[PDB]
Amino acid sequence: DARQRLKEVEVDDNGQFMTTDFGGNIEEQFSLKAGGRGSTLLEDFIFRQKLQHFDHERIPERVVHARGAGAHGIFTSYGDWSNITAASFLGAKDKQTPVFVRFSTVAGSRGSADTARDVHGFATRFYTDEGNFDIVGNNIPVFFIQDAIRFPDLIHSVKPSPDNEVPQAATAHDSAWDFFSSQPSALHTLFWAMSGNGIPRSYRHMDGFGIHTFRLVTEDGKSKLVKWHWKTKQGKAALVWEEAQVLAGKNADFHRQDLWDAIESGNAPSWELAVQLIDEDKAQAYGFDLLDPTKFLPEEFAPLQVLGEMTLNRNPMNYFAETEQISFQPGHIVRGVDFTEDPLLQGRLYSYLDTQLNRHRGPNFEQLPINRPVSGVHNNHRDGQGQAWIHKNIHHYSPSYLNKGYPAQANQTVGRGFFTTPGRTASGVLNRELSATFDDHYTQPRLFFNSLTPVEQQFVINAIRFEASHVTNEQVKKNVLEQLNKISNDVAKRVAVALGLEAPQPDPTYYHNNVTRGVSIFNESLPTIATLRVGVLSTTKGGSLDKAKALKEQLEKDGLKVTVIAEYLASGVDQTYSAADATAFDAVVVAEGAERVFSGKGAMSPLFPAGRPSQILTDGYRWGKPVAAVGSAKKALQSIGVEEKEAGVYAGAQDEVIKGVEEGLKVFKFLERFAVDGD
Amino acid sequence: DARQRLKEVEVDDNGQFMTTDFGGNIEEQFSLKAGGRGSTLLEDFIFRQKLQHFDHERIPERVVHARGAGAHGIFTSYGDWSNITAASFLGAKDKQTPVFVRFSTVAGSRGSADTARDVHGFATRFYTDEGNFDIVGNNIPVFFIQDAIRFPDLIHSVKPSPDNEVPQAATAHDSAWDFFSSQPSALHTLFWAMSGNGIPRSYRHMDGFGIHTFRLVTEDGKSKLVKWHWKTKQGKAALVWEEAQVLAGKNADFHRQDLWDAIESGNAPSWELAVQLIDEDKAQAYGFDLLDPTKFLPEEFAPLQVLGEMTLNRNPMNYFAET
Amino acid sequence: DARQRLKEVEVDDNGQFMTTDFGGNIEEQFSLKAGGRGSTLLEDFIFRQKLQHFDHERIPERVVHARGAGAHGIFTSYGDWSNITAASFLGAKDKQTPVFVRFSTVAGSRGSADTARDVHGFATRFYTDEGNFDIVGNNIPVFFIQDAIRFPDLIHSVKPSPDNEVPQAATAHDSAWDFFSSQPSALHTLFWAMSGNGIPRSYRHMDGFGIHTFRLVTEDGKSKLVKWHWKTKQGKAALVWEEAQVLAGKNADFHRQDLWDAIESGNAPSWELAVQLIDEDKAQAYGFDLLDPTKFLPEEFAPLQVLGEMTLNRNPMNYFAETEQISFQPGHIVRGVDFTEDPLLQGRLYSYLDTQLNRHRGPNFEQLPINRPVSGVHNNHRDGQGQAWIHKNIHHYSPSYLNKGYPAQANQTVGRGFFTTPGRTASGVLNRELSATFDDHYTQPRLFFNSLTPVEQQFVINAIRFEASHVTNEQVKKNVLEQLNKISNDVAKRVAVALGLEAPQPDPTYYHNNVTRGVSIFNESLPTIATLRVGVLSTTKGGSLDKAKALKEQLEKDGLKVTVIAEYLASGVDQTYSAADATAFDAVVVAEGAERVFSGKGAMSPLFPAGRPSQILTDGYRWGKPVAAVGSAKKALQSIGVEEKEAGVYAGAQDEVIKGVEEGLKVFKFLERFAVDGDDEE
Numbered sequence A: 001d002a003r004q005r006l007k008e009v010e011v012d013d014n015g016q017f018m019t020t021d022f023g024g025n026i027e028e029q030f031s032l033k034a035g036g037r038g039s040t041l042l043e044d045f046i047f048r049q050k051l052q053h054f055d056h057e058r059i060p061e062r063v064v065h066a067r068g069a070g071a072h073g074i075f076t077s078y079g080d081w082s083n084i085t086a087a088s089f090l091g092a093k094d095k096q097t098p099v100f101v102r103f104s105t106v107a108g109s110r111g112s113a114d115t116a117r118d119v120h121g122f123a124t125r126f127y128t129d130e131g132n133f134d135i136v137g138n139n140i141p142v143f144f145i146q147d148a149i150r151f152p153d154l155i156h157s158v159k160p161s162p163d164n165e166v167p168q169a170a171t172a173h174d175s176a177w178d179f180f181s182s183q184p185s186a187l188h189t190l191f192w193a194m195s196g197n198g199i200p201r202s203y204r205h206m207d208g209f210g211i212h213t214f215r216l217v218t219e220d221g222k223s224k225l226v227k228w229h230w231k232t233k234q235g236k237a238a239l240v241w242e243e244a245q246v247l248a249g250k251n252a253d254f255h256r257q258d259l260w261d262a263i264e265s266g267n268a269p270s271w272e273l274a275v276q277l278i279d280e281d282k283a284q285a286y287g288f289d290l291l292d293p294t295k296f297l298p299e300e301f302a303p304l305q306v307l308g309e310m311t312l313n314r315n316p317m318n319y320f321a322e323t324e325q326i327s328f329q330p331g332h333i334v335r336g337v338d339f340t341e342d343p344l345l346q347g348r349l350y351s352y353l354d355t356q357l358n359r360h361r362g363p364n365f366e367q368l369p370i371n372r373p374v375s376g377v378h379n380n381h382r383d384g385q386g387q388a389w390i391h392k393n394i395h396h397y398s399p400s401y402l403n404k405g406y407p408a409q410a411n412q413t414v415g416r417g418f419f420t421t422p423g424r425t426a427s428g429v430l431n432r433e434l435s436a437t438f439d440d441h442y443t444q445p446r447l448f449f450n451s452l453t454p455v456e457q458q459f460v461i462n463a464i465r466f467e468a469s470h471v472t473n474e475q476v477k478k479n480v481l482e483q484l485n486k487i488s489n490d491v492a493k494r495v496a497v498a499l500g501l502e503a504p505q506p507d508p509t510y511y512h513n514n515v516t517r518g519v520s521i522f523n524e525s526l527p528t529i530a531t532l533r534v535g536v537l538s539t540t541k542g543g544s545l546d547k548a549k550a551l552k553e554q555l556e557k558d559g560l561k562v563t564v565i566a567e568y569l570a571s572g573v574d575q576t577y578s579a580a581d582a583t584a585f586d587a588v589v590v591a592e593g594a595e596r597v598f599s600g601k602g603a604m605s606p607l608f609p610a611g612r613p614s615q616i617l618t619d620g621y622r623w624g625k626p627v628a629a630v631g632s633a634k635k636a637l638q639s640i641g642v643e644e645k646e647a648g649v650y651a652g653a654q655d656e657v658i659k660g661v662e663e664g665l666k667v668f669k670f671l672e673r674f675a676v677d678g679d
Numbered sequence B: 001d002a003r004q005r006l007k008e009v010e011v012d013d014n015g016q017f018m019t020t021d022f023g024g025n026i027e028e029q030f031s032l033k034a035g036g037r038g039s040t041l042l043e044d045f046i047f048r049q050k051l052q053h054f055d056h057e058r059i060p061e062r063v064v065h066a067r068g069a070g071a072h073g074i075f076t077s078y079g080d081w082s083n084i085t086a087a088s089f090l091g092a093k094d095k096q097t098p099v100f101v102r103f104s105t106v107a108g109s110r111g112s113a114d115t116a117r118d119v120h121g122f123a124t125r126f127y128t129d130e131g132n133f134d135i136v137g138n139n140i141p142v143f144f145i146q147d148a149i150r151f152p153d154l155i156h157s158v159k160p161s162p163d164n165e166v167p168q169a170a171t172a173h174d175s176a177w178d179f180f181s182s183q184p185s186a187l188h189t190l191f192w193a194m195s196g197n198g199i200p201r202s203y204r205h206m207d208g209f210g211i212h213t214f215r216l217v218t219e220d221g222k223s224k225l226v227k228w229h230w231k232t233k234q235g236k237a238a239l240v241w242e243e244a245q246v247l248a249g250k251n252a253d254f255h256r257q258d259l260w261d262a263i264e265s266g267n268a269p270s271w272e273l274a275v276q277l278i279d280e281d282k283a284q285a286y287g288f289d290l291l292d293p294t295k296f297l298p299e300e301f302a303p304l305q306v307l308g309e310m311t312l313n314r315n316p317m318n319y320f321a322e323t
Numbered sequence C: 001d002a003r004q005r006l007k008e009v010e011v012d013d014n015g016q017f018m019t020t021d022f023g024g025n026i027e028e029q030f031s032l033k034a035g036g037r038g039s040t041l042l043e044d045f046i047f048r049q050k051l052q053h054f055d056h057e058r059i060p061e062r063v064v065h066a067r068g069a070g071a072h073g074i075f076t077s078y079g080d081w082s083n084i085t086a087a088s089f090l091g092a093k094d095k096q097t098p099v100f101v102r103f104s105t106v107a108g109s110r111g112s113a114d115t116a117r118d119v120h121g122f123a124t125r126f127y128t129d130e131g132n133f134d135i136v137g138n139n140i141p142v143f144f145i146q147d148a149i150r151f152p153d154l155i156h157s158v159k160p161s162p163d164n165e166v167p168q169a170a171t172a173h174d175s176a177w178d179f180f181s182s183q184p185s186a187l188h189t190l191f192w193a194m195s196g197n198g199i200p201r202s203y204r205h206m207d208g209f210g211i212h213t214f215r216l217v218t219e220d221g222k223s224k225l226v227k228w229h230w231k232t233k234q235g236k237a238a239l240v241w242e243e244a245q246v247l248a249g250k251n252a253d254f255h256r257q258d259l260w261d262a263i264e265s266g267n268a269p270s271w272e273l274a275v276q277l278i279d280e281d282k283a284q285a286y287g288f289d290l291l292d293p294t295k296f297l298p299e300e301f302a303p304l305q306v307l308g309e310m311t312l313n314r315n316p317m318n319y320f321a322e323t324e325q326i327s328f329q330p331g332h333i334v335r336g337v338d339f340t341e342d343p344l345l346q347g348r349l350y351s352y353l354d355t356q357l358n359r360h361r362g363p364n365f366e367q368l369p370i371n372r373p374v375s376g377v378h379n380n381h382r383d384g385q386g387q388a389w390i391h392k393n394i395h396h397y398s399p400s401y402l403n404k405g406y407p408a409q410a411n412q413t414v415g416r417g418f419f420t421t422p423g424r425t426a427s428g429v430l431n432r433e434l435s436a437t438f439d440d441h442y443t444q445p446r447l448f449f450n451s452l453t454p455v456e457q458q459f460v461i462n463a464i465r466f467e468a469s470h471v472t473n474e475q476v477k478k479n480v481l482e483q484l485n486k487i488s489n490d491v492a493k494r495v496a497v498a499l500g501l502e503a504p505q506p507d508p509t510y511y512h513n514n515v516t517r518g519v520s521i522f523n524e525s526l527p528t529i530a531t532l533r534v535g536v537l538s539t540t541k542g543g544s545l546d547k548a549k550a551l552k553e554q555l556e557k558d559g560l561k562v563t564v565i566a567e568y569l570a571s572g573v574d575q576t577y578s579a580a581d582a583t584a585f586d587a588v589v590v591a592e593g594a595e596r597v598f599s600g601k602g603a604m605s606p607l608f609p610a611g612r613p614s615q616i617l618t619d620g621y622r623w624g625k626p627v628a629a630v631g632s633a634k635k636a637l638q639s640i641g642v643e644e645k646e647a648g649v650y651a652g653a654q655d656e657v658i659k660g661v662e663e664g665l666k667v668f669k670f671l672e673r674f675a676v677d678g679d680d681e682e
């Protein structure tokens, strides 16, 4: 049980009498009044203590990544990695360390939709026996900017316009694309966000990245450059934009519910932790500077070496106390790891510690149960708001004769202390500049675009076409085109069509045809279809419901989550047509006999909106899902102009339909149904 | 200009050089580094002051009605109402008073959709020459509960489940309908929220209500029981649920954009302020108790008397500082 | 161990390596720099996490009673008091309840002197098994004002002037006496503060009062009006003002060190909890309204009935986490107690809850270890800044089918819930007025002054003379005289002398000669001299030291704390003359042979200021302390002009001096050394 240490702070209210926050049993359903129909008395201490706590329930949301969700788990190391790092949690084969991970979007506030197009956070805390170690990462290996002093500029430009606070959780407005084109370093992460990484199917179907180059340090001080990677054991999967838009309204909690259900049903998701290891003398050997967070290291130059696996198998008990209150920091570093001179990483170390003072209104946020380490805290810090401990050592200073030298200093040689990499040097003038090695903003965006499948490339262009069409300012649109043309003339030409602007002349300075592995989503089938959802469209009339039940029973044998849909909640029905939508499912199958609700009077009922069964099947097909119909239900496919000839469409007997749908779920999205420019 | 008093705190940065918050011109696009590819210096005061302010931008959202939008305007009285109230802002015909109004949902957090099904807030401030007077009302004339000590129970049950924080901005979960059926007083507002009032076309197409019976008092102390009413001059209009759902995803800012667009285009919305006036000795004479906020007074028993009109004609300059 | 429950949050750093606040061993004595003589790096996470916690150590001081100190202890009930209250902690003989008590002044800020003249706080928390019960009291039985809405006005006027923040922890300025004379209800507490109650010898030598009339309620709902009393087992004792002033500079921690020393040495102080009980139908039967907080009930009308005793025997381990962070509330009420319509108490209930939001900045301050009850918290409260628990019940609302009705309602008949006194009613118009029964502002101030000894009365008049002479506005001083004249014409006349104002004519509307017991300090000797301090003046020359240590050993047998003073820290010396002052002792005895440092060569030394040994003996005598000299040390008494057989002066051999000094410590202050108005006449 990963949450084991949290047991001593859990409060059970079962069978208990109601109390105030200072003890004493009470009733609190009536205000104390002066007479039968009289005013409430100020001396009603019960009312005021109950309502004061309600009035003060909220804390400020995270300044970025406000919308998110998390879970507990365990990390297991695959070996003794002391030859590359002194980190204790990586220091023995099969060694286990509790973790908590929080996934998120970036721009939207609390309560914005999960399926907005955005970069996604992927923050992992290791509760190691030598302190808390956080990998505060994203699902995209590169970031928008090269210097941390520019973060407020990027965030202000993406977040809503400060006059009317429009739009929510979206980059599709003038200020964001004014910034992207004025700060060309942002074009790389932009392309990733316009790809499937911007609209992932679920938290469980994302890779993770530390982005920054860090250092792993051995006991003697020898260091290697390192990139952190999380490889999902569930496979990467993404939606299409027109689907994520509807899903944002039909279920804003799509991703957090997906993670909760997977853990509750015993289908805990897993990620393997992997690293790219680079010698210090190769920091600028691969066509870019590894101190530059706008570039990633192609796996051809350095393969992914997996060190262990992380599995998230415990949901939180109280969302606010655990998920909302947890405070990640890249400064949460342990012996065996060190920073690099990444100018973006450097400023993060200040911002995360400082921002906790705003979110928690005090300096003792590390004493909260979700932030406490398991390894023990011994220093001379005292007081502060909400001080929860009582310190025994009255000689709270060092050096000191009276405290006998305790707590004692720890360094590289005594006490397993943290230490900066011994060989790191400073040389040159104090400057407010960036290295000229950071100047290429176009090569790797082109490299990323080259490494996607044709339809995958079309998704990227259709995302840019959608977003840039929201820009009202003509010159900003031209600025965007001019910057896109430096990455690829064909991309700029194809985007220019939607904008009604002229196809610009090629600027080939950064054009190239190189490709790299591991960045595409749609070029690989899923390794498992467990937890994937199948919507079964049925009806309470006839014998459709009994066949749907048998269909459901066989689908569930393969680990699928099956929802039978009918007009009302008859026996065996999981959801009404009124509450159903294709966005909730990964496959849509029509049960035999249910074709009666796709035309005629069966399609016109007060129990659901007109055309809802046909809308669900139409949505599921046009969004690239596997769609099916059993037996006579092929009339439902015919009613929407779909033939069994097509890939991802299945008809016939029940067994043939189950096999076809289960194979189609590995493909997940059938890209044959999406038109490409000039096809 | 309704916002005329706010101009003295407005800051124009056009044609100016970047500064810190304590003055002095600066550049803030490069951190100070010790060497060409070196670490950032703690002495970079420029970086830390700019990033500290960013790190501390957020304040707690409202515990309820966190999602909303507002605008400035003018309230104009239709008469000298001194025979029913001593309130200065109603003391003369054509008397004008600046206002600010915020419309909102209730359950959803800051970034939730405008077209979620919910009770809607309708909060009005009159900046009168005898103090600020607020009518903090809703677009529905009755409330769920009869005693304020039960408010945390209602809100907890409607807001997301505390284990996973699901669902956002929705009453369609177990805990809400547990409370509705366990506290039957909630059924009246429930029915209003399940009607078109729960999914209005826009803020401009809602009526407003103070819900509570208040008192109007004259200079010598004669009192009347009063219900506040806002009557939209744009007409009441609502969506249908299957449409509001898609709109929640296609444009979560549908209502705040609608209000902003109407004001910017010169189509300022208006509401008439109307009242029902009841004698003190008839507080229990209309088939219910007028101290009960789960009941409204049918207009057949007491028709509306209109006191004036309010027009919202100025959008805010900074949403955070104002709205 | 009253602190037993706090052991689970105690952190022991001995034998450990330094860590950050998120774990991991570190060194934190050098900043990370870019080069040997280079700038500090932003990536020094160790420096910033250490200095951030330092930068944010302070929390707002209490808006009033900012200066004070406290301790843990145990309260023991003397019987089963279910016949008068359903309160659990009073429900059985020898039933024990942990307590924390904080004593304080009122006006001064965090670092002000203990021995300023002020009302003194006396706040007790009972950690009962049915919730925390707080008696937030003072060492004076009446308060300045009659309605809580006037509290900001009283406090603003007593606290420093808002333009320069002068004076600290003092009522001797214009605005304070402008308010006392403009709001005549303040005159009763004024007189108490101008007496010995304003300058007590220690926290342990104070009585305590809940001030307000409260209600005791039995299981069946029967109620009685009640006044809370704390009666010190150490006896009441006070200083003189000219002594308190010097002590304010010589040791600003005099009272908190006294309490700490007494507990550390095994001399835990004790108070008895006593009540006055009044029938509901007699609330206005004793010459005043018992809802009026400016009045106390004379013990002749209702005697004190002891219910138990409280003993404070454990010092805090961390002052901040315990004493500074503890949050008292009169709203901390339990089953068996109820409020009254005392308009001062009524507003307190709102203010103490609200003010914690400023001091603790978050609604979860009751989760702090020192504020937590021992009885268990079960409700549907959630979230809030700094939420320290993880609630299991996901159906956090009532009523509810899903949570099976739990946590469940508790009332008078079910679950031993709190219930308001069932017989209380409201009747009349909603009003912003005060009951005319509150109108008398002068009778009881006169009763209090009538009940002090003659020299005790002179201390009150001399305190007023000192304070009012600081008032610069002429009219305010005249306004003060007119108000004083309504209490006592002779008081106004003796005060008028110091102010150079004419003796006002009698205004006998409220004059009377009644007296009452239990309000005087100097008319009763102390029941014990334990912990009382003796300063033995000695010297390092000759054999004075060896005799001074024999004197110390005998004195210590009787429970006294003895300080042997000499020119330097020789063997057997506790304190140097440079570090010594008479304010730190209750008696001063010159050891035989030490007369050499009172005159001539031995009195002129670079090791202490000029005349220091003579000044200690002079201060000790002039401030009314028992003073003594052994054998040849009688020369020291003669050098300052003190006759060897005055009252409280003891000369002779060692055994005689010990005998006389211990007897004089019971008298404590020798009042015939203070001139009374009319003594200097011819």
Ligand code: HEM
Residues within 6 Å of the ligand: A061, A062, A063, A064, A065, A068, A102, A103, A104, A120, A121, A122, A123, A136, A137, A138, A143, A147, A148, A149, A151, A210, A211, A212, A293, A326, A327, A328, A344, A347, A348, A351, A352, A355, A356, A359, B051, B055
């Ligand atoms: C490679 C670059 C970055 C990555 C991978 C990243 C990732 C993240 C993630 C995942 C979170 C959410 C943590 C959670 O779930 O609670 C977060 C929050 C945050 N980030 Fe970043 N971010 C980056 C750049 C920056 C920069 C440059 C700054 C400022 C200089 C910054 C400031 C913040 C702040 C203040 C928070 C709020 C944390 C809190 O309130 O607990 N980030 N970031």
Ligand code: HEM
Residues within 6 Å of the ligand: A051, A055, B061, B062, B063, B064, B065, B068, B102, B103, B104, B120, B121, B122, B123, B136, B137, B138, B143, B147, B148, B149, B151, B210, B211, B212, B293
């Ligand atoms: C007739 C019943 C009620 C109406 C019409 C109503 C209406 C409103 C409205 C419109 C707002 C948002 C104002 C804005 O736009 O900023 C609001 C906020 C709020 N309401 Fe209510 N509400 C009602 C019941 C209650 C009750 C019973 C309580 C508590 C006892 C309560 C506590 C609050 C609080 C704490 C806020 C937050 C305001 C802020 O943070 O500034 N409400 N209410």
Ligand code: HEM
Residues within 6 Å of the ligand: C061, C062, C063, C064, C065, C068, C102, C103, C104, C120, C121, C122, C123, C136, C137, C138, C143, C147, C148, C149, C151, C210, C211, C212, C293, C326, C327, C328, C344, C345, C347, C348, C351, C352, C355, C356, C359
């Ligand atoms: C009989 C009248 C009063 C008595 C006996 C009394 C006593 C006390 C005491 C002993 C304390 C300090 C508690 C501690 O040691 O921490 C205190 C604090 C305080 N008092 Fe009073 N007081 C009285 C009148 C009032 C009134 C009328 C108000 C306001 C309407 C008030 C407001 C406060 C506040 C705000 C604090 C700060 C508490 C905190 O910050 O924790 N007091 N009082």
